[PDB]
Structures are given as structure tokens and as C-alpha cells.
């Protein structure tokens, strides 16, 4: 009853943290920028982890008996939240890049309306992908609970070929390679800006200060996505071993737990990274708690 205790502890924080982040945004209009529209998507997405994903994860750990639909949803629901975060993280990276690369067209292209539109699409795509095993790509009854109901065990009811090729390599690895690629251009060009402003016949500390702050946001964004791959790779890394190497010692249950748990942890690091990285955020939360 320790994995249960720890998982619960996480659930509370995930809820409190991101809910706080959502509230802070709702109160402080200085945080209601087009950029943070995606941050809320991250909040809602990661809140539901402690809300549902964690509850389900803890449940499916022991396994139960239910129909294929009901069993798949519970097993693949986590994929939706994890996939939605991908789009959010990617969008943010794009956003932070757009501003630095094209500050003038930033306001013309980055619209508070398009933000809401993209977010919606990301979620729709997240469900399609995250719940693709429900489209038929599953192992429900592949060579107890009785007819109709199936032993709901993640590894037994969810195809590995999907979790490796379609899910990881494509829906996770590729984006992370795109995101990382984006930040590459972000900082490379950002420092170029400073060099051009380094050879300017005028002070113009307004441009520098702004640029540095834009970079500070882009850097924070990088740290947010960085912690994502860092908390999910081990899990996929484990599965990559199990699949590509049937011979390779199948990951122990205890080690699998840790890797599984680490993924749930990511939802929590955000609220604290905002309070730490963003001086505007910390002061907002400080207000809420006190009052
Ligand atoms: C309930 C649950 C199950 C698993 C999980 N379990 N077994 C295998 N073989 N793969 C994954 C897995 C790996 C990468 C991405 C998503 C799931 C992970 C988490 C965090 N929660």
C-alpha cells in the first residue's frame, strides 16, 4: 500500500498545482497572454492526470474485469493526456520562436483566437491518437472474468507495436526531435540578435531588455519540455527493450513501477517551475495563498 500512497500524494499535488496555475491566470490579467493559452491546456491536461489517469493507473495496476471499450479507455486515457501535452509543449516552442524570429508578425499571427482554435484541434487529435487502440488496434482476448468481460491488463490488452512505432517513435520521439530542433534555431538566432545589437550605434536597452526577457521565457519553455522527455523516455526506453529485444530481460515490476510513476510526476513539476522561473508567477500565487 505504498505505491498507492505515493501515487495519491502525487495526485493531490498535480491537482493543487495546475489548478492554482489556472486560477492565477484567471485572476492576473498580466498572465492572460496568447502564449499561456497553451499553458492552461497543459494545466487541464496534467490536472486530469491526478484526476483520472492516476486513479486509473492505480486501478489497472492490480487489474480488473470489464468490456474491451471500458477497459481500453481506462488503459489508453493516459495516452490522451500525454499526447495533448506534446502539442501544447510544441506550440509553446513554436510560439517562443515566432516572437524572437518575427516579433512584428508575432502579434499578427499569434492571435488569442488561433490559440484557442489550435488547442481544440490538438485535443481532438490527442483523442484519436491516444485512443487508436480503441479503433480496433488492440489485444482483447489474444491467446476468470467470464464471457464479455476481459482481464484488463495494460500489457495484455494494449498492442506493443502501437506503443513503440506509432505511439513513441512517431507521436513522441518525432515531436521531441522537432521541438528540440525549434529551440536550436531559437537560441542560435537570439544570440545573433544580440550581436547585431552589439554593433549598433545606439544604446537601445529597450530592445535588449525585451529580447533577454523573451529569451528568458523561451528558456523556461525549454526547461518545461526538457522535463517531459526526461520523465517519459525511461518508460519508452524500457518498452523499446521489451519489444525490440524479446530476449532482453523483461523489465521487473518494481522497476516498471518507478518508470511508470516518474511519468505521473511530470504533471507536478510545472506549477513549481513557474513559481521559480517566472517572477511574475510566484508573486501571483503568493497573493492567492495569503488571501
Ligand atoms: C498505466 C500506465 C502504464 C504504463 C506502461 N506500462 N507498461 C508498458 N509496457 N508501457 C507503458 C507506457 C510506456 C510509455 C508511454 C505510456 C505507457 C505507463 C504509465 C505511466 N501508466
UniProtKB/Swiss-Prot annotation:
A Gene Ontology cellular component where this protein is annotated is: neuronal cell body
A Gene Ontology BP annotation from the UniProt entry: adenylate cyclase-activating G protein-coupled receptor signaling pathway
Q: What is its main location?
A: membrane
Q: Where in the cell is it found?
A: Cell membrane
Segments in the Extracellular topological domain: 61-71, 138-159, 245-252
What subunit structure does UniProt give? Interacts (via cytoplasmic C-terminal domain) with USP4; the interaction is direct. May interact with DRD4. Interacts with NECAB2. Interacts (via cytoplasmic C-terminal domain) with GAS2L2; interaction enhances receptor-mediated adenylyl cyclase activity.
Q: What is this protein called?
A: Adenosine receptor A2a
Gene name of the record: ADORA2A
First-to-last residue of the parent protein present: 7 to 305 of 412
Amino acid at each position: 500500500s505504498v505505491y498507492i500512497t505515493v501515487e495519491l500524494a502525487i495526485a493531490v499535488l498535480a491537482i493543487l498545482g495546475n489548478v492554482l496555475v489556472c486560477w492565477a491566470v484567471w485572476l492576473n490579467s498580466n498572465l492572460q497572454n496568447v502564449t499561456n493559452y497553451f499553458v492552461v491546456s497543459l494545466a487541464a491536461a496534467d490536472i486530469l492526470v491526478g484526476v483520472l489517469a492516476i486513479p486509473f493507473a492505480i486501478t489497472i495496476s492490480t487489474g480488473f474485469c470489464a468490456a474491451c471499450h471500458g477497459c481500453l479507455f481506462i488503459a489508453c486515457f493516459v495516452l490522451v493526456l500525454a499526447q495533448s501535452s506534446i502539442f501544447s509543449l510544441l506550440a509553446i516552442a513554436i510560439d517562443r520562436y515566432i516572437a524572437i524570429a518575427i516579433p512584428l508578425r508575432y502579434n499578427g499571427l499569434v492571435t488569442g483566437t488561433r490559440a484557442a482554435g489550435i488547442i481544440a484541434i490538438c485535443w481532438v487529435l490527442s483523442f484519436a491518437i491516444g485512443l487508436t487502440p480503441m479503433l480496433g488496434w488492440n489485444n482483447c482476448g489474444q491467446p476468470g472474468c467470464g464471457e464479455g468481460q476481459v482481464a484488463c491488463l495494460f500489457e495484455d490488452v494494449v498492442p506493443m507495436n502501437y506503443m513503440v512505432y506509432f505511439n513513441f517513435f512517431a507521436c513522441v520521439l518525432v515531436p521531441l526531435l522537432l521541438m528540440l530542433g525549434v529551440y536550436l534555431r531559437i537560441f542560435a538566432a537570439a544570440r545573433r540578435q544580440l550581436k547585431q545589437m552589439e554593433s549598433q550605434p545606439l544604446p537601445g536597452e529597450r530592445a535588449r531588455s525585451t529580447l533577454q526577457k523573451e529569451v528568458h521565457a523561451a528558456k523556461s519553455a525549454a526547461i518545461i519540455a526538457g522535463l517531459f522527455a526526461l520523465c517519459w523516455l525511461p518508460l519508452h526506453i524500457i518498452n523499446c527493450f521489451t519489444f525490440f529485444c524479446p530476449d532482453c530481460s523483461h523489465a521487473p515490476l518494481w522497476l516498471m513501477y518507478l518508470a511508470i510513476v516518474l511519468a505521473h510526476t511530470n504533471s507536478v513539476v510545472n506549477p513549481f517551475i513557474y513559481a521559480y522561473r517566472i517572477r511574475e508567477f510566484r508573486q501571483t500565487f503568493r497573493k492567492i495563498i495569503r488571501s
